[PDB]
Design an enzyme around this catalytic site. Structure first.
Site, PDB file in Angstrom:
ATOM      1  N   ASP A  50      42.079  23.382  44.571  1.00 44.60           N
ATOM      2  CA  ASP A  50      40.682  23.381  44.878  1.00 44.60           C
ATOM      3  C   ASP A  50      39.925  23.795  43.622  1.00 44.60           C
ATOM      4  O   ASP A  50      40.306  24.800  42.999  1.00 44.60           O
ATOM      5  CB  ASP A  50      40.416  24.419  45.972  1.00 44.60           C
TER       6      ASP A  50
ATOM      7  N   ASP B  68      36.555  25.119  42.088  1.00 44.15           N
ATOM      8  CA  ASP B  68      35.244  25.641  42.484  1.00 44.15           C
ATOM      9  C   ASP B  68      34.437  25.968  41.252  1.00 44.15           C
ATOM     10  O   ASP B  68      34.293  27.178  40.849  1.00 44.15           O
ATOM     11  CB  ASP B  68      35.311  26.852  43.428  1.00 44.15           C
TER      12      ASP B  68
ATOM     13  N   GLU C 158      31.292  26.566  39.635  1.00 44.16           N
ATOM     14  CA  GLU C 158      29.926  26.852  39.993  1.00 44.16           C
ATOM     15  C   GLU C 158      29.038  27.072  38.748  1.00 44.16           C
ATOM     16  O   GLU C 158      29.089  28.166  38.127  1.00 44.16           O
ATOM     17  CB  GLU C 158      29.907  28.014  40.965  1.00 44.16           C
TER      18      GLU C 158
ATOM     19  N   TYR D 185      25.543  27.527  52.484  1.00 44.56           N
ATOM     20  CA  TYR D 185      25.193  28.936  52.773  1.00 44.56           C
ATOM     21  C   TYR D 185      24.556  29.484  51.488  1.00 44.56           C
ATOM     22  O   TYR D 185      24.466  28.744  50.528  1.00 44.56           O
ATOM     23  CB  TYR D 185      26.385  29.783  53.184  1.00 44.56           C
TER      24      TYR D 185
HETATM   25  C1  LIG Z   1      28.421  38.117  49.085  1.00 44.54           C
HETATM   26  C2  LIG Z   1      29.803  37.919  48.492  1.00 44.54           C
HETATM   27  S1  LIG Z   1      31.180  38.117  49.460  1.00 44.54           S
HETATM   28  N1  LIG Z   1      29.904  37.612  47.164  1.00 44.54           N
HETATM   29  C3  LIG Z   1      31.182  37.424  46.485  1.00 44.54           C
HETATM   30  C4  LIG Z   1      31.172  35.998  45.889  1.00 44.54           C
HETATM   31  O1  LIG Z   1      31.491  35.032  46.762  1.00 44.54           O
HETATM   32  C5  LIG Z   1      30.822  33.759  46.662  1.00 44.54           C
HETATM   33  C6  LIG Z   1      31.734  32.617  46.085  1.00 44.54           C
HETATM   34  O2  LIG Z   1      32.118  32.994  44.742  1.00 44.54           O
HETATM   35  C7  LIG Z   1      31.130  31.188  46.183  1.00 44.54           C
HETATM   36  N2  LIG Z   1      32.316  30.347  46.072  1.00 44.54           N
HETATM   37  C8  LIG Z   1      32.865  29.947  47.153  1.00 44.54           C
HETATM   38  C9  LIG Z   1      34.126  29.124  47.131  1.00 44.54           C
HETATM   39  S2  LIG Z   1      32.091  30.418  48.560  1.00 44.54           S
HETATM   40  C10 LIG Z   1      30.718  31.110  47.664  1.00 44.54           C
HETATM   41  O3  LIG Z   1      29.906  32.176  48.210  1.00 44.54           O
HETATM   42  C11 LIG Z   1      30.407  33.496  48.092  1.00 44.54           C
HETATM   43  C12 LIG Z   1      29.413  34.476  48.703  1.00 44.54           C
HETATM   44  O4  LIG Z   1      28.117  34.077  48.315  1.00 44.54           O
HETATM   45  O5  LIG Z   1      32.358  35.756  45.099  1.00 44.54           O
HETATM   46  C13 LIG Z   1      32.489  36.611  43.969  1.00 44.54           C
HETATM   47  C14 LIG Z   1      33.740  36.239  43.158  1.00 44.54           C
HETATM   48  O6  LIG Z   1      33.603  34.974  42.491  1.00 44.54           O
HETATM   49  C15 LIG Z   1      32.515  38.074  44.427  1.00 44.54           C
HETATM   50  O7  LIG Z   1      32.379  38.887  43.305  1.00 44.54           O
HETATM   51  C16 LIG Z   1      31.351  38.471  45.351  1.00 44.54           C
HETATM   52  O8  LIG Z   1      31.881  39.678  45.874  1.00 44.54           O
END
Ligand SMILES: CC(=S)N[C@H]1[C@H](O[C@H]2[C@H](O)[C@H]3N=C(C)S[C@H]3O[C@@H]2CO)O[C@H](CO)[C@@H](O)[C@@H]1O
Length: 539
Positions: free
Chosen positions: A288, A290, A292, A367
């Site tokens: 996968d 990801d 971003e 989301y």
């Molecule tokens: C609110 C939270 S749990 N933040 C997390 C963060 O999560 C992201 C994620 O990186 C992004 N990628 C996905 C696949 S789903 C998406 O959304 C979540 C929450 O917004 O990830 C961080 C690590 O990369 C972490 O530090 C943070 O705690």
């Protein structure tokens, strides 16, 4: 007379094809992949003639043979396939073979072939479902959730999923390559330690302790070669052979290296190292991605180029070609997926209508539309549609899906995201007509683990009683809770907005639903994901 009956000597009975060095922090020293496990057996003969040939049998089949030259012997041999074997020593002469009683030996391999199935009871509010809809049901499990969150692999409701994604596999690189990590205490340094001696742009493991060494249910014995999340994932696979377990590379803080992969040298090296990771860790079913995000506007305000979309499509095509090849060598089917921004402005940086041809699923991150990162524009963080008070809202699930469809993405590729958490603000004021979203805020709501964010579990445990108002917006398809005395406001998914998404997926023929992150659910969200996609109740 046939030889006397030999006695297997007490000794180690557990060997590994892939070895983990118990005293190493660099991923290169940590993992040694061999062609086969080096096994050892010894024996004694206490009564009779020692015979002329000694043999080690594994399930009756000889793995070693040699001259029997004394009352004691030792055999060293190679075993190339994992499992648990009934091993015997036999002593042979012209008058016959005499075999010892069987001792079981363990030859470990990273498919978990040596492991008892990790089959655990559903917990909290989780109810069993059959994966018979043909729709994706996925969730992320986070590597660091085994700590404060105390959520481990044995606690995943695994039968209720088709897809389990492991967040996150990191790509090696120091200054300039993984600067987003510097925002988290210790984390940049943990990655450099893991990557010591290892080329930049190769994958690694961010926390080898949690991944491979922390004791956890079914893998607590000192000589178990794989413990931690990986050893559990291995045993989970033994219990659920059709569960797809995918490593997610990137995520919010680990995406910086993708921005350099316009350089084909670095991109090739990345793809080569994913191939090697999959040959190393056999329990994973693909990859996968990801990133971003292609174009930037992720964690790092200094990265992003117009070239990114091309890079992305190239990277997908090259990963497919590498997965096709791996698939042909192993006979397994391998998957290539990606989690992507649901905003149209980021969607339009990439030709997903070209990249889909390489990909099995697109995980649409529907989301984080609104949150405490913006105190002035309040809205539903994960809604299906715009609300009645702002029908032209930019960020909705539907606007995301429409943007892909409009590119020409096939609807079956598209997996709609649900949140197993809420985001919210405190001090909301200045709102009209009893809609607190038309107001403005003074801060993040106090969060479960970090401010502005609340696990779904706690929303349901703590914020549906007392002074908390609860409203389900049926136009948006979005629940929220509001505490007027403090102006505390929380936007989240619930069983009902999840049914709305699952029903959408069925009407529109999308690929299914996935969620972030499994540790935060109490069972309500995953239950509703399953029901609403039409999976059958019961074991
Ligand atoms: C609110 C939270 S749990 N933040 C997390 C963060 O999560 C992201 C994620 O990186 C992004 N990628 C996905 C696949 S789903 C998406 O959304 C979540 C929450 O917004 O990830 C961080 C690590 O990369 C972490 O530090 C943070 O705690």
């Amino acid at each position: 007379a046939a030889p006397g009956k030999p006695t297997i000597a007490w000794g180690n009975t557990k060997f590994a094809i892939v070895e983990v060095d118990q005293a190493a922090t660099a991923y290169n020293n940590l993992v040694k992949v061999k062609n086969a496990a080096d096994v050892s057996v010894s024996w004694n003969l206490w009564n009779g003639d020692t015979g002329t040939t000694a043999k080690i049998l594994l399930n009756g089949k000889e793995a070693w043979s040699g001259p029997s030259t004394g009352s004691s012997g030792t055999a060293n041999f190679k075993v190339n396939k994992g499992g648990r074997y009934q091993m015997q020593v036999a002593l042979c002469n012209a008058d016959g073979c005499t075999a010892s009683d069987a001792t079981e030996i363990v030859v470990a391999d990273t498919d978990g072939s040596h492991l008892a199935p990790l089959k655990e009871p559903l917990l909290e509010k989780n109810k069993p479902y059959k994966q018979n809809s043909g729709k994706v049901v996925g969730s992320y499990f986070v590597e660091w959730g085994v700590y404060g969150r105390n959520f481990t692999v044995d606690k995943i409701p695994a039968q209720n999923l088709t897809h389990l994604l492991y967040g996150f596999i990191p790509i090696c690189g120091g200054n300039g390559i993984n600067d987003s990590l510097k925002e988290i205490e210790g984390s940049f340094q943990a990655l450099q330690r893991s990557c010591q001696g290892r080329e930049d742009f190769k994958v690694s493991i961010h926390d080898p302790f949690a991944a491979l060494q922390k004791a956890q249910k079914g893998v607590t014995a000192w000589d178990d070669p794989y413990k931690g999340n990986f050893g559990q994932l291995m045993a989970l696979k033994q219990a659920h052979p059709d569960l797809k377990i995918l490593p997610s590379i990137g995520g919010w803080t680990l995406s910086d290296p993708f921005f350099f992969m316009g350089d084909k040298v670095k991109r090739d090296r990345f793809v080569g190292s994913v191939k090697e990771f999959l040959q190393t860790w056999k329990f994973f079913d693909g990859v996968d991605i990801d990133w971003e995000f292609p174009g930037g506007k992720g964690a790092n305000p200094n990265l992003g180029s117009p070239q990114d979309g091309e890079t992305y499509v190239l990277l997908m095509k090259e990963l497919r070609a590498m997965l096709d090849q791996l698939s042909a060598e192993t006979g397994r089917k391998y998957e290539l997926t990606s989690a992507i921004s649901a905003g149209k402005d980021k969607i339009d940086k990439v030709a997903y209508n070209v990249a889909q041809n390489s990909m099995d699923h697109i995980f649409l991150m529907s989301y984080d539309f609104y949150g405490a990162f913006d105190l002035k524009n309040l809205g539903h963080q994960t809604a299906l549609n715009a609300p009645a008070w702002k029908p032209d809202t930019a960020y909705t699930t539907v606007n995301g899906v429409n943007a892909l469809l409009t590119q020409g993405v096939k609807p079956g590729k598209i997996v709609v995201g649900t949140a197993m958490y809420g985001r919210g603000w405190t001090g909301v004021n200045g709102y009209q007509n009893n809609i607190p979203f038309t107001g403005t805020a003074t801060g993040p709501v106090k969060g479960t683990w970090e401010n502005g964010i609340v696990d779904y579990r706690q929303i349901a445990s703590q914020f549906m009683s007392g002074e908390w108002q609860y409203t389900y917006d049926a136009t948006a398809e979005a629940p929220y809770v509001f505490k007027p005395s403090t102006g505390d406001l929380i936007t989240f998914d619930d069983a009902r907005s999840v049914q709305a998404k699952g029903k959408y997926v069925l009407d529109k023929q999308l690929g299914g639903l996935f969620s972030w992150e499994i540790d935060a659910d109490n069972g309500d969200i995953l239950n509703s994901m399953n029901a609403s996609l039409g999976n059958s109740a019961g074991v």
